[model samples]
Target: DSVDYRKKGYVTPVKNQGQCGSCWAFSSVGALEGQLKKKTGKLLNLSPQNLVDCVSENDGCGGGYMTNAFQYVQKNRGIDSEDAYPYVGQEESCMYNPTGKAAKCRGYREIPEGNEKALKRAVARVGPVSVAIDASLTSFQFYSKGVYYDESCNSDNLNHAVLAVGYGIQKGNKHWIIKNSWGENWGNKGYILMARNKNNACGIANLASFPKM
Candidate 1:
């Protein structure tokens, strides 16, 4: 299948990463929302707040695994919207529900750490995959440049989430085109493309995906 290079847009606002440390939820759900639109041709503003509030299997606010969040959406059916459950951008009270507009996350395919083949396979089959990387303040501020590799990329301290839309080479550098939730005013209309071939800062290695049901 030919990879669609067209840019997919996001519905919700570019949320602020406050004291909550729930970047996993935002990144996971954000990718899902976009994939849902691509697959089903339906656009629903799914709520990351709902995922954060109700995903009981994972850590509530202070960071959680991306796989766990994907499973939560799959099992729970789906998540709601910020209109139904507003996102304060901080860890707050839990408001669980049984039914909502949030589409159930169908399932996910895991890309092994540092496996470029697996990452390409997942993206080719699925729409976009949710990836956890060392997105520091600098990453958030990245406007546009070229392929990047960070030797200091710490996995243990990883705190940001993004969507791996696709992979390609620019000016002879292999890179993963990443969609961020930082807002349009940020990098290339709220998106950044990073190095893929090189495990710079382990960014390419840490990539993963969550497919829509």
Candidate 2:
């Protein structure tokens, strides 16, 4: 089921943070989604929606890095429920602390961009890894349902970012498993397969993964 890893709990579809420019929120949630499943095996559909709304101290929606988001979550001791703070697809106010039941993120490991070995090891050992790459992606390319790839389609507009789940070989070539937030109707179920060693623009084609603690 290398192609259909989603059914095996190896991957999952995620909703985009949209024009809010919350790549960090999506990346952090992507990693947590897989990690939560790995730990509890309950497929807890944790919400990036919550992250987008509750994460503070950084650029709420103007865009920020994954590490900063992770730190914010860890420091806050946890985020709130998606029900309490739904994602509006744009930056807004942080509200709802009814029970304070949110759990703080314990910080994240850093993975340098474009280190394939590190990326693979991190995903295999931990869960998923947040990645920022050249976002000149197109809408017509064929790829996995939840992965993301930056082909030369919109080669000049590097804006979006995503997460790396795993790695596999396709059509006799190596590729990375990327989970995107463009909804499930996009690529291979809202994912994409990128050249593992090709090193796309900014060397993102060879994006790295965060280390495991």
Q: Could you say which candidate leads in TM-score?
A: 1
lDDT of 1: 0.67
Q: What does candidate 2 score in Cα RMSD to the true structure? A: 3.8
> How well does candidate 2 score on lDDT at residue 83?
53
Candidate 1 residues 1-213, lDDT tens each? 334334444334455546676777877876777677776776666677776777776666777777777787787676676567777676556674655565667777677876777877777666667887776745446656666556666655556777777777787877787767665677777767777767445455565767557
The list of candidate 2 runs beyond 4 A from truth reads 1-7, 96-104, 137-158, 200-202, 205-213
Query: TM-scores, in order shown?
Result: 0.81, 0.78
